[PDB]
RNA sequence: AAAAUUUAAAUUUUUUUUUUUUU
């Protein structure tokens, strides 16, 4: 399983990016449009940017917690690649590096993080809790999976609901889902990946004693792109201006003060999707409630 | 294993150490061992530690931390966890030589874990934690040495209030500076092998490697006990023995076994 | 609530350090000299660690081969006595460690001259030992002498540390009361650049500092290969003087 | 008998004389020169002085 | 169950369609392709049926013929061993 | 947990209860296995113990490593249904197995292929109101009954004896040891320690050779 | 009179012709007349180390001598291998380098000598003549272009080895001279490899030739005849 | 009929099919023929691998069989001989339930069936006929039958059926029965009876499909 | 309203007719009957052609199946000696192609190709089931070296069908526009590879973006329109 | 036969005949990957015209050959022959099961009864 | 004043599920 290009073709892009050009259309630091569905059921999307096709899913269910957090209820994403979306990958490599790659990422991006509250899947604080699961499926790459599941995860989150609880000591007593409303989930902020792309045109030596930094840097590498690129790097920030994290792992050596010129530009692009996500959700709720009010007047 | 030796070798190997003036291939005397380095006390976050170092470069480091526990909820209040670098866990001669040393430390059997008793109601539970690094040796009887050293060089907490919780049920407590050293009797371990009507002492990787059988001897208290193997070394050269030769080895280990001890017993 | 003192008004840390200080660096070269070409000792504090190298040799299979460059294995050994606490269950495929098996691969991608050692084998053998905090920078400044410990082709000195953040200041040398206490970065840095090898932020981080924040650690950095440097000359020294 | 022979000359033109002779006769031979190898692990080796000199210093297995 | 059809030559003497059940012996499951396989306890009842159709047709009557020979393989052993 | 199989909801959990020279013997039966080449039966009782186990052989497969000059020897003991021996318990038994066979197998007959062994720890009674020592001696039995029955070149009937956690394996009718395991005891209790292993070894070897040669 | 050396120390993880001595990483000059081979990598000017070495400048030549690492293959010399693999017609062999040398299947000595001419049957016969781990004389042909050599026989001097034993050594100490068979009183020879490593065997006739049957040169046989004199004399 | 298809709908894939019937959305890839591995191939015929995913959890032993028994399908459907040593993995995501997969397998199999057949088409590989799967189930408490129920009738549903035909002659002919799942209780007399309407109801169900077929790459198809 | 087809259909033409096969369509080696496999529309060979007709149908793949006779472009990944490595398609099962099939056929002189060279070769043999093989110099060239190695370049993938179109037919718009705008080269492969080079990379990337489009949107008609902007789209700049 | 090199021919090994017919059939199952497995290389089919070798015209996948041993080569697989006219291919399917059942022409061709198709292949002496 | 003189670089597959480290 090895993708095969010609160096004839390794260096026509490098040219490309020689003469300041990309395949694509965008330009350099430029990023693909997002389009963002739902399905019928809550924590259902369909999220496409242009060529990669990504789908999550979250639930809940019932479970006590752990001896570790005994406050606290359960949580964990699932990121189970299938060779369906592009014939590189093996049936479900949870050891594949790669896919680590795409792991302690949206590890990080949401665990270590927290952007949603554990504390508040206490139902009952040792006995009963919330098992919420985030199962992530890939469609078909053009890369920015990693971007791509950091959205969809986020996405999924705001739009998913549980259903109603009563507590009397064992007598715990999930309601019947339509006369008791489902009930959202609280998100503590929401964090936005950036891949960062990377290109010496150059030698090693070039880049390490030529002291004239000359390395191209850009937005969401499309899958020829990707597969010529010499370091990696995602940062991830919010909307209050705070550094999520960072993800430098090795690869091509890299100057400090791009990286802050870089993360600079991150900003002003993740905040218009931001918000975009926010109109969506409500005005997807809003067709809801709408054709909830197409319903009750129709009922 | 390890090498892969040359046939016509193979012949004057064990020609040479078949002789009835026995040869060794360095020519030692036949009860002989190699000469070692033998370090310990240094990695100070621990109860004790220890680190040994052979003549063809065989290495390892054995580490101590305790825990306390209930003497009365856990039967094991003592475990072996050993790691060979370059291995599985899944491999064999990780987990024989693993659950050997288990046996070896039984709780009563050479082992005095009324010295290891903190109250009526608990006591320590140690952990011998084993990293080799590397080896081209039957590995096992290096290891119990560095583990005599171990405990030889381990400390431990001293208790400040009583020892009797099945009434008043205190919660122990110790002072935080005082330690005081583990008394322990630990036992030792040795190789053997068999070659036509010879027995070595430490058989080296080559000595190791043409040998018919070999043995495993436990050491402890200033005498013989178990556990005791019969064990191959290699498996192209596995031959039978007569029983006197057995009974041959084991004064020839104990008639030279102290002094082994006490050149390790020595502070 | 800690009951503790993080850092003092003074301008004092928990043994007294400044925030632009180090802990004692100590490294050693051939101590191993029956067990591979690269062995080196590392004591960053009490981050203590055994590295070790093997190559540029011959595979176990020939479907682990190529024909143009070499290849990097990295095996870490985190022992359960590494820390105060004892942990239970063993690492060797902990998808945290994995991380970092990913990352000195691409952070040593490119010190090799890997074309110029094809059809062969580096591999890289990790012995975590004693374990203070700092721990990912304190890796890379071991690897940094085994290659050179064996004299492997390569560009130039790599240097790594972990450097924290108490709420506007920075922390040189963290430990790991320290790091489960603020805020930290390692910066993987390299030789006497301003070029970045490894960079990795796990903590929250607002935005505003982290410019002054990546400025801090050069210093740190550069004082680091300083130190590498001439610990290896004054043992470079002592083999012809009495070689010869 | 299955053996190789030597056949010499000090001249190109003195075996392109002698080659496509015997390559009419037996066919099967070599031919080594400076200017063209044909048939290197051929039965019968036409070649000139220096290239059996060239191939006694390091030691030709050819030999 | 299996149901297998007939090459003509393949024969030596001492369409066609054979019903063939309790299944062994690997160069029968090999080359049997259309099978049934059937859950029933005594009396008519049936717990599960199990049809990959991958050689042959199935008939509608070795359908009832596999069903009579259901009733019976099953009740036997319901009486055979009387626990 | 482990999602390759069914294990039901993890809380669960099972059952609990509290409290409210003699002679051993045999039934030794082969050729029941049509997987194998090569099996034995073994039933054994004996005062507060009953004891049965299954030894099945592969042989000879085809390696796919590369050369050898002969025959390599790969054994396994699984754990059946109620008793349940540790793992590492089990391996160092598979260590001491190998060691026998080596001077048992002629792999010189057999190069480049390879001898599969599979041990089913099916069933043991326990009744008694260095557990696997007590039944060592047994296995090597079992696995010679098998081997014989693959028809490989073995040179001699060796069989183990036991006496009170000592297991002392022989051949050539007791004239040689193959095979030595010690466990705690006595002190200088090996010479009755001979005996009591040999004449079982007597006993066992004969009661092997009426199971096949009245066959 | 005694067993083993048991001397202690605890309490530590350690007991603790002048020319330039260089870095990676490190600048020697910016000359540009200077010429750039091993060692040395370079951006124009700048005449960068990339080892821990000795700085060689011969005559317009400037080059990086490293001091560590592994046995360099040159040809011409007289080397021992250990017989690691067998190829097609090919056979692979450890120097104690990089990697394998390579030796082809009609560069071997045969018995009878080369009346014995070719034979495709004789490669269904590679591991009658040869087989793993064996330990021989060789003689260093030439390379490829990576720096792989290969190896031959060419002499009867050169062949599989007998009669002793081996030893192994860093191959630094090992001084170069235009002999390497090397004749000792004790009736003994040993036979040094340059790459560093060491066999020894009894002096056979054949050396004995050196200072004043040949079908037997893939046995595993010895000289039946081994005095412990000859034997313990072997181990001083 | 509110069943509706999408052909071709992936992008580094060979073929691909998203497969909506009434309430369950599963989406089908086809990858093939491409390199087999060494452990994998077949010196005569093709071999097949064949990966489910759930919507919900991972990869066990529930999704297991519903893979096993599709194997069973497909290997009469493929013109097998046609590609020696050689692999197709074939791929299939269940993105929407439409059923308890806690209690239920039922539509999902009728679903991945229908999905795979399209995505094979897209694929272009030499095939054998032409297919259709429903669910049937049969009522506990009123004793009838549906063709195609609901996860809340298959509460009420006493035994739940998946059947499986194989159509030729125009998709006209039964050319043989390929899976017939029959669970849940049921005697003789209901069977011929539950073959009698999906019989007809899968030639109705691929009476709409070869028009979608056409429909959808006759522009795709050059003239 | 075609002869469009299925799998599973009832084959149209009589049996006693003396037809060619083409793909598409199967025979059995078991019961000898011959069968539609694949999905599409058949077009029927007309009458005339000596009394023999053919019979194939068009279906739709990207997944190449290689061929005899096909010019195919291919990419150079291994050096087994006197007979290259060489794949067609990522994924698939590499080719073997002769190191002394080319047009100055000589054995004592090995050519000089590398490792991740693009050449242009036609399929000269290849069973169903065997490792099949190429040739750039062909007897079917009749001496012709008029396959070969590339230069740089640029190559784009397409899908087969399309791919057909663009060898062979010539009311294909595609080269008509392109030779409209600039001048430059063209290398057709069957396995949907399609090798241009022009004067400039800048044309090459308006080469690039049209062929991208136009075949997704594969709309031959509108073909004029959708070229020309690209240029725009470059003569932005 | 399992796979057909440009290369080389590959089999696995069934059953040893005997000398003064008496066989010996492996009671292994293939189908683990288990049995030993030979190669032929495609200039050892035959001695006559050794060099241009078409190994296509006397092979396919899953056939019946009668070969005789070279040596043991490696531990992976076998060295082996068939270049007598006496020996060779013994039986086979006709398009590799897809038909019925093919004998030889000649010794050195192969076709088959009911079909009239006939393929290359080198059959052994009858 | 002729005459002529030198090379040679390596090919086709063996492995065990994810916790869990001190506000």
């Given at each position: ?145 990693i ?36 009930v959202?989930?609280?998100?503590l ?17 070039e ?10 840097s ?9 597969l ?21 792992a090795?690869?091509l ?47 | ?22 040869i ?34 065989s ?5 101590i ?26 491999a ?57 050293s ?23 407590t ?7 050293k ?86 | ?49 055994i ?23 990295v ?21 945290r460690?994995?991380?970092?098996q ?52 390569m ?44 960079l ?43 070689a010869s | ?63 | ?37 059937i ?45 | ?7 039901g ?70 754990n ?27 792999l ?6 390879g ?101 | ?8 120390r605890?309490?530590?993880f ?48 400037l ?33 104690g ?84 068979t ?49 034997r ?5 | ?194 073959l ?19 429909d ?8 | ?68 006779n ?129 004067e ?38 | ?45 035959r ?13 396919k ?65 009858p």
């Open positions: 399983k090895d993708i095969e290009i010609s160096a004839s073709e390794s260096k026509f892009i490098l040219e490309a990016l020689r003469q300041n050009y990309r395949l694509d259309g965008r330009s350099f630091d430029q990023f693909r449009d997002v389009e963002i569905t739902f399905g019928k059921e809550f924590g259902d999307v369909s999220v496409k940017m242009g060529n990669t096709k990504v789908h999550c899913r979250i639930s809940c269910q019932i479970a006590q917690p752990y001896e570790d957090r005994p406050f606290e209820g359960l949580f964990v994403i699932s990121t189970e690649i299938s060779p369906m979306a592009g014939s590189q990958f093996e049936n479900g490599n949870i050891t594949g590096e790669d896919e680590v790659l795409c792991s302690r990422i949206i590890e990080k991006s949401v665990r270590r993080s927290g952007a949603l509250d554990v504390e508040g899947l206490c139902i009952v604080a040792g006995s009963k809790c919330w098992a919420v699961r985030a199962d992530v499926h890939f469609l078909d790459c053009d890369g920015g999976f971007d791509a599941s950091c959205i969809a995860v986020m996405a999924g989150l705001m739009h998913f609901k549980k259903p109603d609880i009563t507590v009397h000591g064992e007598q715990i007593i999930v309601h019947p889902v339509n006369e008791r409303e489902p959202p989930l609280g998100i902020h929401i964090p936005i990946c950036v891949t960062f792309s990377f290109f010496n045109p150059q030698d090693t030596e880049n390490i004693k030529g002291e004239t930094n000359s390395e191209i850009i937005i969401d590498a499309t899958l020829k792109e990707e010529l690129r010499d370091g990696v790097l995602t940062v991830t920030l919010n909307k209050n201006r705070e550094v999520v994290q960072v993800s430098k090795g690869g050596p890299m100057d400090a003060l791009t990286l802050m010129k870089c993360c600079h530009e991150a900003y002003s692009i993740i905040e218009k999707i931001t918000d975009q996500i926010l109109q969506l959700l409500k005005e997807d709720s809003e067709k809801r409630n709408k054709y909830a009010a197409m319903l009750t007047s129709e009922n | 294993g390890h090498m892969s030796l040359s046939v016509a070798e193979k012949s004057y190997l064990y020609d040479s150490l078949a002789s009835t003036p026995s060794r291939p360095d020519g030692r005397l036949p009860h002989q061992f190699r000469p070692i380095e033998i370090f310990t006390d240094f990695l100070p976050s621990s109860n004790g530690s220890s680190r040994i170092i052979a003549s063809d470069g290495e390892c480091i054995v580490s931390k305790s825990k306390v526990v209930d003497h009365h909820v856990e039967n094991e209040l003592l475990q072996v966890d050993v790691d060979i670098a370059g291995q599985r866990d899944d064999l001669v990780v987990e024989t030589i693993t659950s050997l040393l288990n046996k070896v430390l039984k709780s009563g059997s050479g082992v005095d874990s009324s010295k290891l008793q903190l109250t009526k109601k608990y006591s320590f539970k140690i952990f011998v934690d084993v990293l080799v690094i590397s080896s081209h040796s039957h590995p096992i009887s290096l290891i119990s040495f560095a583990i005599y171990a405990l030889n060089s381990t400390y431990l907490p001293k208790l400040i209030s009583a020892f009797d919780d099945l009434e008043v049920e205190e919660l122990p110790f002072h935080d500076y005082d330690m005081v583990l008394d322990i009797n630990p036992p030792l371990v040795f190789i053997l092998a068999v070659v036509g009507n010879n027995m070595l002492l430490d058989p080296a990787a080559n000595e190791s490697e043409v040998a018919n059988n070999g043995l495993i001897i436990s050491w402890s208290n200033g005498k013989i006990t178990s556990p005791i193997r019969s064990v191959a070394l290699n498996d192209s050269n596995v031959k039978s023995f007569k029983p006197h030769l057995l009974k041959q080895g084991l004064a020839m280990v104990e008639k030279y076994a102290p002094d082994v001890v006490r050149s390790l017993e020595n502070l | 609530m800690s009951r503790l003192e993080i850092y003092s008004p003074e301008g004092l840390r928990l043994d007294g350090r400044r925030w632009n200080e180090l802990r004692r660096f100590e490294s050693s070269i051939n101590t191993h000299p029956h067990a591979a070409d690269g062995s080196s000792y590392m004591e960053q504090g009490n981050n203590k660690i590295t070790l190298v093997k190559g540029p040799k011959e595979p176990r299979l020939k479907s682990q081969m190529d024909t143009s460059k070499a290849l990097l294995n095996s870490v050994n985190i022992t359960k006595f590494s820390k105060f606490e004892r942990s239970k269950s063993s690492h060797k495929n902990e998808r460690v994995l991380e970092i990913t990352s000195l691969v691409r952070m040593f991608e490119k010190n090799v001259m890997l074309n110029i050692y094809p059809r062969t084998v580096i591999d890289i053998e990790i012995h975590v030992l004693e374990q203070d905090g700092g721990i990912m920078g304190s890796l890379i400044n071991g690897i940094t002498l085994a290659l050179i410990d064996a004299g492997i082709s560009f130039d000195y790599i240097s790594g540390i972990s450097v924290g953040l108490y709420d506007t200041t920075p922390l040189l040398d963290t430990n790991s009361l320290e790091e489960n206490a603020m805020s930290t970065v390692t910066l993987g840095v390299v030789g006497k650049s301003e070029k970045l090898s490894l990795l932020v796990e903590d929250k981080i607002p935005l505003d500092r982290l410019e002054n924040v990546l400025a801090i650690g050069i210093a740190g950095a550069h004082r680091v290969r300083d130190l590498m440097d001439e610990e290896l000359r004054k043992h470079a020294q002592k083999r012809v003087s009495n | 008998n299955k053996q190789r022979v030597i056949y010499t000359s000090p001249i190109k033109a003195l075996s392109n004389q002698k080659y496509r002779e015997l390559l009419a006769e037996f066919g099967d031979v070599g031919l080594m020169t400076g200017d063209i190898t044909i048939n290197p692990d051929a039965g019968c080796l036409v070649m000139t002085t220096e290239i059996l000199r060239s191939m006694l210093y390091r030691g030709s297995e050819v030999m | 169950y299996g149901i297998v059809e007939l090459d003509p030559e393949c024969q030596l003497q001492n369409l066609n369609t054979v019903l063939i059940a309790d299944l062994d012996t690997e160069a029968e499951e090999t080359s049997i392709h259309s099978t049934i396989s859950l029933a306890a005594p009396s008519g009842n049936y717990k599960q049926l199990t049809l990959m159709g991958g050689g042959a047709k199935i008939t509608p009557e070795m359908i009832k013929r596999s069903l009579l020979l259901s009733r019976v393989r099953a009740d036997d052993l319901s009486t055979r061993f009387n626990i | 947990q482990d999602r390759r199989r069914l294990l909801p993890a809380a669960a959990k099972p059952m609990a209860f509290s409290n409210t020279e003699s002679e051993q013997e045999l039934s030794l039966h082969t050729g029941f296995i049509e997987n194998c080449n090569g099996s034995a039966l073994v039933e054994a009782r004996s005062l507060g113990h009953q004891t049965s186990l299954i030894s099945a052989v592969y042989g000879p497969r085809s390696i796919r490593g590369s050369f050898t000059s002969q025959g390599t020897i790969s054994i396994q003991l699984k059946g249904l109620l008793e349940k021996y540790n793992t590492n318990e089990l391996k160092e038994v598979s260590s001491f197995l190998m060691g026998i066979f080596n001077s048992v197998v002629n010189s007959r057999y190069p480049k292929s001898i599969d062994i599979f041990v089913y720890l099916t069933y043991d009674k326990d009744l008694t109101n260095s557990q696997i020592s007590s039944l060592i001696p047994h296995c090597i039995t079992s696995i010679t009954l098998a081997l014989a029955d693959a028809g490989i070149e073995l040179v001699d009937m060796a069989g183990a004896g036991e006496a009170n956690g000592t297991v002392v394996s022989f051949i050539k009718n007791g004239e040689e040891i193959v095979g030595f395991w010690k466990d705690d005891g006595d002190d200088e209790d090996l010479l009755e320690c001979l005996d009591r292993c040999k004449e079982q070894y007597n006993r066992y070897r004969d009661l092997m050779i009426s199971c096949l040669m009245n066959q | 009179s005694e067993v083993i050396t048991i001397t202690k605890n309490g530590a350690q007991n603790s012709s002048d020319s330039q001595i260089v870095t990676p990483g490190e600048l020697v000059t910016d000359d540009p007349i200077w010429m750039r081979g091993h060692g040395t990598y370079f951006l124009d000017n700048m005449t960068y180390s990339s080892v821990a070495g000795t700085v060689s400048r011969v005559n317009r030549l080059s990086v001598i490293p001091l560590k690492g592994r046995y360099a293959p040159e040809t011409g010399d007289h080397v021992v291998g250990r017989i690691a693999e067998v190829g097609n017609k090919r056979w692979k062999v450890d120097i380098g990089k990697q394998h040398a390579v030796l082809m299947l009609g560069s071997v000595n045969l018995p009878g000598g080369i009346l014995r001419r070719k034979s495709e049957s004789d490669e269904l016969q590679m591991r009658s003549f040869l087989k793993e781990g064996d330990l021989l004389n060789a003689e260093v042909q030439s390379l490829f272009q990576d720096g792989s050599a290969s190896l031959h026989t060419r002499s009867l001097k050169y062949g599989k080895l007998r009669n002793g034993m081996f030893c192994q050594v860093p191959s630094s100490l090992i001084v170069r001279a235009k002999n390497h090397h004749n000792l009183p004790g009736n003994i020879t040993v036979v040094l490899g340059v790459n560093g490593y060491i066999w020894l065997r009894k002096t056979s006739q054949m050396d004995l030739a050196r200072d004043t049957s040949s079908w037997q040169i893939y046995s595993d046989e010895n000289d039946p005849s081994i005095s412990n004199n000859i313990q004399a072997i181990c001083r | 009929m509110s069943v509706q298809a999408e052909i071709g709908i992936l992008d580094h894939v060979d073929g691909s099919s998203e497969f909506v019937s009434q309430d369950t959305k599963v989406i089908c890839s086809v990858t093939g023929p491409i390199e087999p591995k060494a452990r994998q191939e077949l010196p005569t015929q093709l071999a097949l691998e064949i990966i489910v995913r759930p919507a919900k959890g991972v990869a066990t032993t529930r999704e297991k069989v519903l893979e096993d028994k599709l194997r069973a399908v497909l290997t009469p459907l493929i013109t097998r001989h046609c590609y020696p040593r050689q692999l197709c993995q074939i791929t299939c995501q269940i993105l929407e339930s439409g059923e308890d997969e806690a209690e239920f397998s039922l539509r999902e199999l009728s679903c991945c069936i229908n999905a795979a057949f399209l995505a094979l088409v897209d694929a272009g590989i030499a095939l054998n006929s032409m297919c259709a799967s429903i669910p049937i189930a049969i009522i506990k408490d009123t004793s009838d039958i549906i063709v195609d129920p609901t996860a809340e009738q298959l509460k009420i549903s006493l035994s739940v059926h998946t059947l499986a035909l194989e159509f030729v002659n125009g998709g006209k002919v039964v050319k043989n029965v390929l899976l017939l799942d029959s669970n849940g209780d049921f005697n003789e007399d209901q069977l011929f009876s539950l009698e309407l999906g019989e007809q109801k899968c030639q109705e169900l691929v009476t709409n499909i070869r028009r979608i077929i056409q959808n790459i006759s522009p795709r198809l050059v003239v | 309203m075609s002869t469009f087809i299925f799998p599973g259909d009832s084959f149209p033409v009589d049996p006693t007719t003396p037809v060619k096969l083409g793909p598409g369509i199967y025979c059995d080696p078991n019961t000898q009957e011959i069968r539609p496999v694949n999905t599409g529309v058949l077009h029927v060979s007309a009458k005339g052609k000596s009394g023999v007709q053919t019979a194939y149908i068009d279906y739709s793949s990207k997944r190449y199946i290689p061929s005899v096909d010019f195919v472009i291919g990419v150079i990944i291994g050096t087994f000696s006197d007979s290259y490595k060489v794949s067609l398609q990522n994924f698939s099962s590499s080719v073997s192609l002769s190191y002394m099939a080319f047009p100055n056929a000589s054995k004592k002189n090995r050519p000089t190709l590398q490792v991740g060279d693009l050449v242009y070769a036609r399929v000269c043999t290849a069973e169903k089931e065997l490792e099949a093989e190429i040739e750039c110099f062909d007897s079917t060239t009749g001496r012709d070296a008029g396959f070969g190695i590339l230069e740089d370049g640029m190559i784009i993938d397409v899908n087969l069908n399309f791919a057909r179109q663009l060898l062979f037919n010539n009311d294909f718009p595609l080269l008509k526009v392109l030779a409209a705008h600039t001048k430059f080269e063209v290398a057709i492969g069957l396995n949907g590879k399609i090798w241009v080079k022009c400039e990379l800048s044309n090459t990337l308006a080469c690039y973006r049209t062929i991208m489009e136009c075949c997704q949107k594969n709309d031959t008609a509108a073909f004029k329109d959708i070229a020309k902007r690209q240029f725009k789209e470059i003569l932005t700049v | 036969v399992t796979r057909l090199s440009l290369q080389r021919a590959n089999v696995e090994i069934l059953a040893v005949e005997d000398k003064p017919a008496t066989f010996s059939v492996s009671q292994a199952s293939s189908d683990l990957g288990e049995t030993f497995r030979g190669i032929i290389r495609s200039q050892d089919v001695s006559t015209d050794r060099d241009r070798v078409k190994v296509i015209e006397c092979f996948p899953g056939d019946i050959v009668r070969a005789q041993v070279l040596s043991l080569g490696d531990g992976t697989n076998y060295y082996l022959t068939t270049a007598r006219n006496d020996l060779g291919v013994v039986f086979a399917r006709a398009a590799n099961g897809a038909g019925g059942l093919m004998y030889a022409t000649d010794w050195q061709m192969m076709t088959s009864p009911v079909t009239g198709a006939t393929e290359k292949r080198k059959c052994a002496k």
